[PDB]
Each structure stands twice: as C-alpha cells, then as structure tokens.
Design a protein around this ligand. Structure first.
Ligand SMILES: [Mg+2]
Length: 1202
RNA sequence: AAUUUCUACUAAGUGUAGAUCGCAUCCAG
DNA sequence: CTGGATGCGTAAAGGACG
DNA sequence: CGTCCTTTATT
C-alpha cells in the first residue's frame, strides 16, 4: 500500500535530449575542405526566405477560396445561436450546425485540384515559379529542387490552416467560432443602435468607404456574412466601424465613433461594435551597440519629434487654468490613487469625497453593490475632483505644479546627458561593459517614461459628455508622438539585459533533405546517420553523400578493437503502417485480399462506432496477421507473438500489440580500424555525442538526461524509454573571442562566493574562462526520446488520486506557501492535521558523497537587491534577480519531489487565478507561475536519479502523478497530486482556534465608534487575570457571515507591534487610555461608560487599541527575528496561541511563525477536500467540487481543532 | 568561474548540485 | 516578447532520372 | 536497373 506506486506506466510523453557533438579526427578538416557548413548556413537563410514566398502563394490561394464560398446554414444558425434558453438537444443542434459550417470551409479548400499540389514537391518546382514575377525570387525557389523533403515540416504547419476541426490554427475556426460569433454580436448591437446613425452620416460611408457597391446595412444581415470571410472583407467591415481614410486623405467617421459622440453627449452607455479578427495569414530587436546608440540619438535628441511634443505639453499644461475644469477628465484606475496622493497627500481622500455622497449598516451584498458601482464609473472631471477639494485648495493649480515639475526633471536629466547627443560622440566600450552610458540612457528614458505614464491619466476613456476639445486637440496631437518612447524603452532594455553570447544556430543537413530522419537499420543508407558506441563513449557517424553505403561493407574484426554499431528496428504507428504496406499497389498485387477484407476496409466496419462489426474487424486482424508473416521485413525483425484473435475488443487492441512488439535496439560489432579509415578518408564524419558527464574527469552524479540517454541502449530498458527519430544536428557559431574572455589565471587563488562554504578560496593549476563554451563553434545534437510509448496503467489520474485519497487512512499533505521573510515555507501534515515537518526553504542543501553544503538563497536575493539599490535600479540587476529566482525554483522542485516520495504525499499549492498577491512576498506571481509549471512538468515522470533505474521511482519506472501542462489558467482545482487552493484566511488566522478578525476597526465617526462598542455583548476588566475581556457574538456586526462559531471572547493578552514601530503592552495601554479620560474600568461592565465619553480622541485611541488586539501578526521589517503570530482568543484549554512558544521548539505541533502558519493552513484546505472525498461514493468522486469557500473554510478550521 | 542548456557554484581540481521538450507554425494584448 | 495552441518527432511505397 | 528524392498510411 502506497499511493505513489500506483502511478507508473500511465501515459506516453516526448522529451528532447541535447548534447555537444565533438568532431573526431579529420572530421572537421574534411568538413572544412568540402565547405559543407557554409552551404548549410546559407541554406537556412535561403530557406526562411522561400517560406515567405511560399506563404505569398498560400495567401493568394486562401482569398480565391474564401471569396468563392457561400455558407449554407447561415440564417438558421444565427437564429439558434441567439436563443438564450436552449434545451440541451438544441445546444447539440447548434454544434452540428457549427461543425457543418466549418466543414463547408474545409471542403471548399481541400476540394480543389489545386489543393493537393500545395504540400507536394510541385509547389516549389512548378507552381511557385510560374506565380512569381521576379527573377531573383524564382532563383531562390529554384535553388530548392531535389530538396523538397526538407519542407515537410513547414508543409504540416500550413495544412493545419485548412482543417475543419475547432483548433486555433484553422481558417474555418477563425471564421465560424471567432469571427461569426462577433458578427452576430454586432448584429445584436446594430438593431439596438440603428436609429442614431444620421441619414446623411450613413450615405457618407457608402461613398467614401463602401465605394457605393453595398449599403452599410448589408454588413449586419446574417446571410451577408460570406463577404467577411476574406481579409479584404474584414478590412471593409472594420473600416465601417473604425472609420476610413480615403486616397484624398479626408477623414471618414465610423459607426463606432458616432456612437461615441451620442453616448458621450447624452450621458448614456449604449454598446460599441467589436472589430473582426484578421484572417489567419494576412500581414524585432536591436542588433548592435551602434544601432542602439543611433536610435537613442535620433528619437530623443533635442530636435527629435518626441522632444517637440514634450515642449508642447509643457505649454498646454502651463495654460491649464484657461480651460474648463468640467470638461477635463481623469481615467479611473491606478491613476486615481496616484493623483489623490499628489495633491491632498492622501490616497483615499478622493475615495472618501465620493464616498461622502454615496455613504449606516453594511450587508456585504450592499457592500459589493457599494464596491462595484464604484468600479463602474469611467472617470472623474477636474470639476468633480474640485467638488471634493476642500476650499482654499486649487486642484488645477497644484496639478500644474506637479506636471511642470516632471518636465523640469526631464530637462535637468537632458543636460546630464548632453554629450550623448553630440554628432561627435563615439563609443569607447560596449554598453554592457559601459555602465556609465547605459545609466545615462536609462535615466532619461525613465523620466520621459514617468512623465508619459503620468500624463496618460487625462483621458477618461471618453465616451464622455462634452469634452474640452480645445485642450484635447493639442493634447492628443502631442501625446500620440510621446507614446513612441514606449517601444523604444522596451527594445533598449531587452538589449542591455540580453546575454553577451548568442545561441543563434542553424541546421545541418549534410546535403540530404531527409537527413537523419530515423534510426532504422534499413533506412540507414537513406538517412546517412547512425550511432556508434566505444566503451562509455557514444558517437554520431554520418556518411558523406558520395559514400552512402560506406558503412554497410564493414565486418566485425576478431583481433583488433571494434565499434558497436546500433541496430535499430521500428515499426512506426501500426495503424498507419499496416494498411499502407498491405493495401499498396506493390503488396495488394502479391496478396489477393478477399472482397470481404477490402470491403471491410473501404467501408470501415473494423473501426469502432456504429459501423462496427466485431467479426469484420476480427477478420481484418487475421488478414494483417497472415500478411505480417508473409512480409519477412517485419516478421523476421520482430519475434511477433500476438494475442489470440478472438480476444481483441477492437482493432486498436491488435495494433497496440504490433506497436509494442515493433521496436528493437541492439548492437553489431564493426571494425574500429576499418571505421576510423573511413573517417580519415573523408568518407564518414564522426562526432562524439558529449556533455560534461562523459569527461574522463567526471565523478559523481550525472545529469538526469545523461541517464535517459544511456538507458536507451541498456538491456534493462524494455521500451520504457524509446529512442525516437527526427533528431537534428545544428552548428552554433562562436559568439565570443578567447582573448576577450574573463580568465582566472592558473596558480593564483580564486575567491569563493558562498559564505557558507568553509573553503574561502580555490587555486587551480590551470586557467578557467568565463563562458568558455561560446568562444568556439559548437555542434549541438538534439535527440527525441519516447517515454512510456505503450502505457498499461490507463485511468484518469485525478479520479484515481481521489479514490486512493478517500480510502487512504493517514493521507499526508505537503503545504507550500510564499513568505515575506521566507522565499517558500514548507509544512508537511498528516491525515489528522498534525504538523509532521515545518521549515523554511530559504536555504537549499546540496549533498554530494556524505558531505552537505547549504546555499542560502535568501541571502543571495538580499545581496542582489542591495546591488539593485546601488546603481539606481539598473536594468541588469532586475534581470539577474529574475534569473536567480528562476534557478532557485529548480532547486525547490527537487526538494518537493523528495517530500512527495518520502511521505507518499499530495501537494497543496496556492491557486494563482483567484488569490491576491501581497507583494510583501519575495517570489512574485510571475515566478511562482513558472514554479507551478515546473512542478507539473517534473511530475509527468518524476524520477530519483540516485535510485536504481529498474525500481519504481527510477529512471525507467518514473511516477506519473501529474497530467501534462496546458495553461496557467488551468493551474486550478486539481492536477493529480497537486491541489490548487485559495490563500484567503490562511495567514491571519489563529491555528489553535480557527479565529479570524472579521471586524472593521477603522475609525470614522464618534457615532460609529459608539455603535461598535455597544455591539459587544460585554466589555469588562478581569482582575483575577489582569486582562480586558471583549465578549462578542459576530451576529451583531456587519460582514461576519463566514464565521462559524460566532461567539468569541477577545482578551487584551500580551503585546503587539504598532506600525515607525513601537511595542505596545495591550493591558496597560487600555488602562492608560481609560485613566486619561477618568473611566472607572473596574466597575463590572464598562460599555455604558465608554459611550458616555464625548471626546473624539478617546474613540480613535480606542479603535486603534482594538485594531492592535485583533492584529494577530506582528512583524518588524528588516528584523527577521520578529515575525510573531499571537491570538486574542483562548483555546479549548484556556491557553492563548503565541507562535513564539513553538518557534523555540524543535518539533512543534503548531505553526512556528506567520509564514509557517500560511503553509500549514494551505495544507489543511486539502485536508478539508479529502474530507469531501471521504463523504462521497466512489462512483461520484469525479463529481466532488474541491473549491473551498471562506464559509466552509472557517467551519473546518474552527471545528477540527477540538 | 568551466556546463547540451539554465541557476547556484568551485563542491578538493578541466569540474559540483538540482533542473532541463526540441523543432517548426499560427493567434492574441 | 510571452503565453496560448497547432503539428512532427517514420519506414516503406512510389517515382524521376541516368 | 540502382540511386536518390518524394509521398504515403493514419485506432
Ligand atoms: Mg553532475
């Protein structure tokens, strides 16, 4: 009984193995003399070119077929599409109609005579040259005759367009699922908005745009859709909506603009047309220090056009008073928070002064319709914002001082940069070497980018009642010039942040269009590439075109050394292969196949479905079984051993046995003397398939991919991992010069970087070079493998994880959470919620031999954040930090995998589509998304390198506890062993009681502060404890639906940390507050006395004292020692929860700090969901919904503690 | 600071530890 | 540019060409 | 013929 070991051999998946290919002997010499690499480097260039010309014809072919087309179902479909109350049968109707619509478009394409030619040899030899009218381009296409097969891959990518399936890549799908669906929505909107378009306004568009061949109304009748299948039609349709610009240049207004005026001017909100997407084929970064520099000077010198539009926006905003403050608007969003702060000094005072009208009891259904109508508003006028501005304070004047301040900042930064704009300037050093220069370009770009990103607030997305077009005329003119800095900012950053070496490579073919197609022994002379072994070394051996068969003559050499030559036999895809061979002109003539059998095949009775006869299919199988035996190229390759034919449920049952039997990999001896001569003579080329684990100097643990690669040829690997074909060989030209490499000169000591390494220094007898691998041309070889090609353990992984979980008695849960002090914190939990382990992942501990050496990745991040502060916020340090986090998580994966294996444990992770990230946490959402993706990926085939490959857990019996990754949005609910959970109420919650603080203690009014103090059942001093007790029933406060217990007794126990920061003893600070106002707190219930008091500074000291008692988390920033979590509520046994009582302990039973509490409670939510699985019938486990609500959660946390 | 590649390294001396699905294509803001 | 999605990860029939 | 490039078959 293990959950894990039920999950081996579940599904098949592809991986690519990558290797340096090192030439051997004369190989590189012979390759240089024959000038082969040049030919390839050119070919790749020319190939990209021809693909574009090919596309040109493809694009012409598509318009021909789309123009012609006339869709049949249309009206009928649109109508059913529109029905808002469809019986399920009617939704199936609607699908069949949508399928038929797509099949119409597909059949329109594939039914040409022209179609089969597009992806055959013919398109390059004859069609494209006739089509083209340039002599150069025709020469390019001509260069590829006898090399058509190299286009197959591209051909497959273009085929996806002509599909009828509902797939992103399809033309049908783009027409029927995306563009038709929009057209229909626009019809809907049109009949609502039809009348407002002025009689005159419409006739404009029919002449200026439509050219008087169709009426504007035509474009909103269903039956007229066919017109907008083509990119041309779409260009028209979108022009009607967006507006056009004629040959003359006269602006012509579009329907969507007219609507904008009407809804603006009458303070209304009618809807607007969506434009149609483009059709599927219709129509880069900076490459050198000089090009980057040149752009910086040309777009941003003092007489560039962007600088001109700054000078104009200075004059416009200097004249801010001269304009109407009721027709100037500020878009709603982040810019409202910012501009609120800029002029009041307060983020949420502008929030308040429209809360001043809207604002007293708060049911959350009224609080959402509160908080939502809020978000509905589009913008605010300078008049409305002055309606909020207390008298004596001019909103327009202080805005003028802020905007004008930002342009003086730009001009000041221009004078510090002036020498970069001299026509006389030349660059001393490379930019990545020249920090001075880049920081000069950054500083200017920033100040321009902040001015730009600030000013952008003055839009209002309007859609806006009468706008000061005297202001927006000059503003829009000049802002559209200013927004060009955006592109220029990105591309110049992306450049400085790039690496100094390039990975640019190109594909080698060795003059063979199907080069290295597959490893099959028979196809070995066609592909001209095979694999050799000698001892622990593996080589790629490539026959030269003029000596294809040169390896076929070589015999085993008894006396001398021998190579091992691979002997590989694959039957690829019996469902594809078995028919082609046995119904081929060649074989069909040899083997009379009865009219039954060809009927069965032509008819399709063997294929499951309604046409299926188990007997017909059974007869086809014995046809295939005899032919295979009459076909000795298979029957003698694979010792075939089929199941008795009566036992097959379907054809796929037989095929699956062929597929698994039809793979064999062995080795043959081949004379090492004879093969080496071939290489010298230039008849064979030889590369060692190499990575660092094959070095004579390597010791200790190989890369996982080395192990996979070796296991391919191991006799304990029985198909678990197949060597696939379609490997590629590439040359990556060097991108660095040895002389310009950083060298650590031999025999001088080098300073070690890791503070936790005892050894502070290493001295080597040899030189070591930074980025050495890129100072040299490198061959790289990519080998695709096939894991679990024939899976036996077929079941839906999640349903199986739910069954095992339900019937598992003590299910363990690894909870992972992101901390502020801790990059990641781990809490392992048992089936009853006892903390088994709990620790931080700030330090990664690497083990080699019996030694351990830890690397504190929290120290590393802290030092790279300091280095970010020094040198402003340099572009690169941001990247270094991004990459460092990116590598951190790949250490963490290993640890999580260990925990899974050790505890047979499910994983509880944060759902990143629902929750809200606090940004106190170091590992931002983006990086964590990457981590959850990596985790899914590893667990498709989770292996322990250090295990025996044949053991479960090993490289041949990898655990498959995760379904193949799809999309970030799909990282929700559950994926096998990984459960995604909302982080709500996982941190700030008493792990000992389930208590959370559902009170709002923000002070507003003296009256509000009274109703609060009266809503408590009791407020008293307790002398025998020296504590103030605040008994409540959450019934009496608003927004407390989620709590389950409801009646709590708060105490002012222990201290808190107010936020600079002061420690506050709670008990004595209440005494202090009450004594300040002559309140006798010892007199039983005190609630009347506090409400008797009439001083507002009493209530705000009290609400602040309530805030502190309910702030369970207390933290001092920079002080990693002080992250304590302390409860105001007593548990079953009348003890308060204080986290520090457990951080002390070595094996604690409750969370040791705030971060620990986070992880713990995320793992408990999974425990709740396992609770649900145990409540459900086995058959209905699929149906159980995992998403735990706040209401369900608080119930679980408040009842499970006991 | 060496790498199929990436991060962290120097890990006891040309390397250590973990990770590592390639290639092509299309579509989106 | 980076996530979304597509597809290939093949031996053997078949043909052009000298 | 041979040899090299192209095309084929799909649960
Ligand atoms: Mg290693």
């Amino acid at each position: 009984m293990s959950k894990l070991e039920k999950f081996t051999n579940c599904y098949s998946l592809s991986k690519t193995l990558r290797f340096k290919a090192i030439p051997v002997g004369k190989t590189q010499e012979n390759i240089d003399n024959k000038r082969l690499l040049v030919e390839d480097e050119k070919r790749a260039e020319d190939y990209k070119g021809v693909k574009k010309l090919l596309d040109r014809y493809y694009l012409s072919f598509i318009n021909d077929v789309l123009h012609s087309i006339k869709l049949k179902n249309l009206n009928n479909y649109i109508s059913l599409f529109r029905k808002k109350t469809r019986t399920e049968k009617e939704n199936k109707e609607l699908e069949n109609l949508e399928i038929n619509l797509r099949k119409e478009i597909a059949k329109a394409f594939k039914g040409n005579e022209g179609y089969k030619s597009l992806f055959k040899k013919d398109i390059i030899e004859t069609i494209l040259p006739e089509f083209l009218d340039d002599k150069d381009e025709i020469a390019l296409v001509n260069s590829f005759n006898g090399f058509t097969t190299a286009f197959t891959g591209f051909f497959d990518n273009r085929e996806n367009m002509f599909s009828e399936e509902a797939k992103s890549t399809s033309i049908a799908f783009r027409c029927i699922n995306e563009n038709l669906t929009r057209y229909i929505s626009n019809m809907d909107i049109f009949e609502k908005v039809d009348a407002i378009f002025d009689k005159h306004e419409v006739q404009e568009i029919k002449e200026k745009i439509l050219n008087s061949d169709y009426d504007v109304e035509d474009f909103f009748e269903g039956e007229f859709f066919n017109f907008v299948l083509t990119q041309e039609g779409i260009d028209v349709y979108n022009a009607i909506i967006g507006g056009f610009v004629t040959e003359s240049g006269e602006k012509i207004k579009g329907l969507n603009e007219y609507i904008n005026l009407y809804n603006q001017k009458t303070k209304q909100k009618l809807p607007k047309f969506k434009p149609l997407y483009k059709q599927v084929l219709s129509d880069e970064g900076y490459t050198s220090d000089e090009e980057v520099l040149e752009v910086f000077r040309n777009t941003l010198n003092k007489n560039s056009e962007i600088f001109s539009s700054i000078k104009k926006l200075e004059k416009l905003f200097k004249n801010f008073d001269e304009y109407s403050s009721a027709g100037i608007f500020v878009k709603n969003g982040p810019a409202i928070s910012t501009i609120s702060k800029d002029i009041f000094g307060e983020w949420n005072v502008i929030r308040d002064k429209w809360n001043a009208e809207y604002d007293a009891v708060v049911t959350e259904k009224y609080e959402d319709d509160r908080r939502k109508s809020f978000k509905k508003i589009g913008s605010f006028s300078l008049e409305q914002l002055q309606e909020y501005a207390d008298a004596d304070l001019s909103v327009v004047e202080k805005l003028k001082e802020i905007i004008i301040q930002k342009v003086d900042e730009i001009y000041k930064v221009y004078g510090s940069s002036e020498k970069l704009f001299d026509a006389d300037f030349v660059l001393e050093k490379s930019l990545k070497k020249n920090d001075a220069v880049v920081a000069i370009m950054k500083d200017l770009l920033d100040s321009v980018k902040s001015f730009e990103n600030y000013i952008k607030a003055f839009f209002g997305e309007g859609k806006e009642t009468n706008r000061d077009e005297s202001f927006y005329g000059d503003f829009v003119l000049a802002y559209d010039i200013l927004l060009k800095v955006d592109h220029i900012y990105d591309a110049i950053r992306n450049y400085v942040t790039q690496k100094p070496y390039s990975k640019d490579k190109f594909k080698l073919y060795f003059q063979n269009p199907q080069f290295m197609g597959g490893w099959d022994k028979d196809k070995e002379t066609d592909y001209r590439a095979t694999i050799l072994r000698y001892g622990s070394k593996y080589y790629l051996a490539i026959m030269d075109k003029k000596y294809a068969k040169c390896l076929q003559k070589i015999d085993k050499d008894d006396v001398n050394g021998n190579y091992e030559k691979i002997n590989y036999k694959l039957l690829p895809g019996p469902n594809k292969m078995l028919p082609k061979v046995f119904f081929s002109k060649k074989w069909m003539a040899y083997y009379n196949p009865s009219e039954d059998i060809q009927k069965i095949y032509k008819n399709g009775t063997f294929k499951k479905g309604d046409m299926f006869n188990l007997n017909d299919c059974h007869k086809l199988i014995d046809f295939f079984k005899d032919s295979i035996s009459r076909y000795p190229k298979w029957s003698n390759a694979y010792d075939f051993n089929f199941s008795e034919t009566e036992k097959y449920k379907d054809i796929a049952g037989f095929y699956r046995e062929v597929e698994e039997q039809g793979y064999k990999v062995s080795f043959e001896s081949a004379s090492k003397k004879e093969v080496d001569k071939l290489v010298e003579e230039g008849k064979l080329y030889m590369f060692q398939i190499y990575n660092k684990d094959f070095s004579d100097k390597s010791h200790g643990t190989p890369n996982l991919h080395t192990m996979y690669f070796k296991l391919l040829f191991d006799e304990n690997n029985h198909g678990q991992i197949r060597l696939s074909g379609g490997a590629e060989l590439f040359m990556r030209r060097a991108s660095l010069k040895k002389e310009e490499l950083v060298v650590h000169p031999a025999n001088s000591p080098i300073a070690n970087k890791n503070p936790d390494n005892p050894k502070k220094t290493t001295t080597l007898s040899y030189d070591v070079y930074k980025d050495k691998r890129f100072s040299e041309d490198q061959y790289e070889l990519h080998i695709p493998i096939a894991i679990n090609k024939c899976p036996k353990n077929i079941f839906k992984i999640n349903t199986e994880v739910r069954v095992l979980l339900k019937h598992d008695d003590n299910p363990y849960v690894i909870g992972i959470d992101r901390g502020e002090r801790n990059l990641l914190y781990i809490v392992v939990v048992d089936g009853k919620g006892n903390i088994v382990e709990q620790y931080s992942l700030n330090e990664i501990i690497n083990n080699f031999n019996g030694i351990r050496i830890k690397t504190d990745y929290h120290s590393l991040l802290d030092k790279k954040e300091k280095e970010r502060f020094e040198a402003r916020q340099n572009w690169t340090s941001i990247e270094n930090i991004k990459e460092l986090k990116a590598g951190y998580i790949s250490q963490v994966v290993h640890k999580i995998c260990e925990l899974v294996e050790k505890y047979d444990a499910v994983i509880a992770l944060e759902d990143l589509n629902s929750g809200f990230k606090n940004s106190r946490v170091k590992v931002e959402k983006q990086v964590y998304q990457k981590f959850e993706k990596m985790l899914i990926d590893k667990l498709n085939y989770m292996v322990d390198k250090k295990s025996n490959p044949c053991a479960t857990g090993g490289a041949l019996k990898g655990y498959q506890i995760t379904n193949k990754f799809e999309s970030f949005k799909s990282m929700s609910t559950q994926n096998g062993f990984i459960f995604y959970i909302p982080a709500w109420l996982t941190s700030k919650i008493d792990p000992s009681t389930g208590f959370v603080n559902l009170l709002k203690t923000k002070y507003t009014s003296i009256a509000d502060s009274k109703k609060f103090i009266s809503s408590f059942d009791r407020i008293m001093y307790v002398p025998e404890e020296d504590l103030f007790e605040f008994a409540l029933d959450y019934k009496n406060f608003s927004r407390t639906d989620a709590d389950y217990i409801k009646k709590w007794k708060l105490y002012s126990y222990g201290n808190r940390i107010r936020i600079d920061w002061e420690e506050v003893c709670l008990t004595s600070a209440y005494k202090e507050l009450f004594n300040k106002y002559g309140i006798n707190y010892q007199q039983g219930d005190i609630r009347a006395l506090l409400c008797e008091q009439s001083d507002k500074a009493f209530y705000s000291s009290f609400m602040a004292l309530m805030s502190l008692m309910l702030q369970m988390r207390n933290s001092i920033t920079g002080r990693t020692d002080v992250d304590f979590l302390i409860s105001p509520v007593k548990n079953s046994d009348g003890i308060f929860y204080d986290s520090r009582n457990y951080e002390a302990q070595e094996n604690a039973i409750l969370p040791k700090n705030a971060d620990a509490n986070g992880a713990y409670n995320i793992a408990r939510k999974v425990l709740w969901a396992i609770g649900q699985f145990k409540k459900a019938e086995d058959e209905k486990l699929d149906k159980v919904k995992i998403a735990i609500s706040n209401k369900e959660w608080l119930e679980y946390a408040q009842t499970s503690v006991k």
